[PDB]
């Protein structure tokens, strides 16, 4: 769950 902007 790391994805550009959207990350936790």
């Given at each position: 769950?790391?994805?550009?902007k959207?990350?936790?």
């Amino acid at each position: 769950x790391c994805f550009x902007k959207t990350c936790x």
